[PDB]
RNA sequence: GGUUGAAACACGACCUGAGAAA
């Protein structure tokens, strides 16, 4: 097989102020004791914000003022894994946190060449909560610029993320799903939608599958026209 | 005093084939320990250019960058569709590192007009005591657009959200959602529901609307 | 300042130069 480099990120999620939790960030396709890894997230809304490093060969550690002696990072070479142990959290941490290798000086010099894909940690007392599904129903009546379009409205859930597909994944042309948008109650609602033929509203079946990984909730959702 | 990195443009819009440059200040020398990346929101950011001038194995060819004393350019001398991101510059001269503040990267392209479509509320929904409306604006450039919601033909306020998607990334185009949030109580007191959409693709605004109710 | 040891420190080899905290 092709030995591919990836770092996979694990831990993050929702926890109260003041509380802690540990990011792992597991290393295939080469060995983490010969690379220094680093730690970087972005706040929403917000730019990248470099927190903390660590050093191949010493293992010497480095942080940013606004997480020291607060956060510690650190790595296990007999996992190929890093951490970033978070105390003490405030509700400014909330952020995407990437791991990233740095690559090899003759080669990237001091760039960081592979990222994780990020984790989310959300520093909030709120509860979670799963989302309903409401049905954004179509027409041959209502037609625009030659097409359809129907949708699903996905609302009231906390925290983020949730992700929206069609058809099992199946239908993948003229689907266009929102950024979540937060509601004055605190929860996220968004909306996915597909323009479709008008033609094709009887003839085809559309599901949207919704999936909400923090309240486990999956649900699918048949939308149709409304008989009338 | 941690070094800073000034980044400009912030944002800019550009066709495809054009040549884009955008640079970045340090506050003090960095000597030639500049990285550039390309960030997609929400995902992780790419490896562009390392040590100021050399270009990540694999990127491509169209990126380059270059270094004048604190002054640092990224140049993409032919841009293409899917480049439109977040750019950001990050220095490692010494720790702490710190990056740019970014520059958005928009495709420009012609205008479209776009298509509108509005939605009542489900009766699965009604039962739980709001009423949500939707109105969609799909596939349409420039990004700018207006959309009036009107009641019994009354203007509505304050009670309406807008979400938007990024540009597709074939045909540089939008798609816009507007979602107006009513108490059931208020939504069954009245009938006309409508989404009003001005936008320079359109000679006249477009006006979508159903009847509570009435299929 | 640059090359280089999987290597910004620690543990090493070098180049430019009066000196790489230049």
């Known amino acids: 097989e092709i030995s591919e480099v990836q770092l996979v990120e694990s831990g993050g999620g929702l926890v109260q102020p003041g509380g802690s939790l540990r990011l792992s960030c597991a290393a295939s396709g080469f060995y983490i004791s010969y690379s220094s890894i680093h730690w970087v997230r972005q706040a929403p809304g917000k730019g990248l914000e470099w927190v903390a490093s660590?050093?191949?060969?010493?293992?010497?550690?480095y942080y940013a003022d606004s997480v020291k002696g607060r956060f510690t990072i650190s790595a296990d070479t007999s996992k190929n894994t890093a951490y970033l142990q978070m105390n003490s959290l405030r509700a400014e941490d909330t952020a995407v946190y990437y791991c990233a290798r740095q690559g090899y000086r003759r080669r990237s010099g001091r760039g960081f060449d592979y990222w994780g894909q990020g984790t989310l940690v959300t520093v909030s007392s709120a509860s979670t909560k799963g989302p309903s599904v409401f049905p954004l129903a179509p027409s041959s009546k209502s037609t625009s610029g030659g097409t359809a379009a129907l949708g699903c409205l996905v609302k009231d859930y906390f925290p983020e993320p949730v992700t929206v597909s069609w058809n099992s994944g199946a239908l993948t042309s003229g689907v266009h799903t929102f950024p979540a948008v937060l509601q004055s109650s605190g929860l996220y609602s968004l909306s996915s939608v597909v323009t479709v033929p008008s033609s094709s509203l009887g003839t085809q079946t559309y599901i949207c599958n919704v999936n909400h990984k923090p309240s486990n909730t999956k649900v699918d959702k048949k939308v149709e026209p409304k008989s009338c | 005093s941690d070094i800073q990195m000034t980044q400009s443009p912030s944002s800019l819009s550009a066709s495809v084939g054009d040549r884009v440059t955008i640079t970045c200040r340090a506050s003090?020398?960095?000597?030639?320990?500049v990285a550039w990346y390309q960030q997609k929101p929400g995902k992780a950011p790419k490896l562009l250019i390392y040590s100021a001038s050399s270009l990540y194995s694999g990127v491509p060819s169209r990126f380059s960058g270059s270094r004048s004393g604190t002054d640092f350019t990224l140049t993409i001398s032919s841009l293409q569709p899917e480049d439109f991101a977040t750019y950001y510059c990050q220095q490692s001269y010494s720790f702490p590192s710190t990056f740019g503040q970014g520059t958005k990267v928009e495709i420009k392209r012609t205008v479209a007009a776009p298509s509108v479509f509005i939605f009542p509320p489900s009766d699965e929904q009604l039962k739980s005591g709001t009423a949500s409306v939707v109105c969609l604006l799909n596939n349409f450039y420039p990004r700018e657009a207006k959309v009036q919601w009107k009641v019994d033909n009354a203007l509505q306020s304050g009670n309406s959200q807008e979400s938007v998607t990024e540009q597709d990334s074939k045909d540089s185009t939008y798609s816009l959602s507007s979602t107006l949030t009513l108490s059931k109580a208020d939504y069954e007191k009245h009938k006309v529901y409508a989404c009003e959409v001005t936008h320079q693709g359109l000679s006249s605004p477009v006006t979508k609307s159903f009847n509570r109710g009435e299929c």
């Open positions: 660590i050093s191949p060969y010493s293992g010497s550690t």
């Open positions: 003090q020398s960095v000597s030639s320990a």
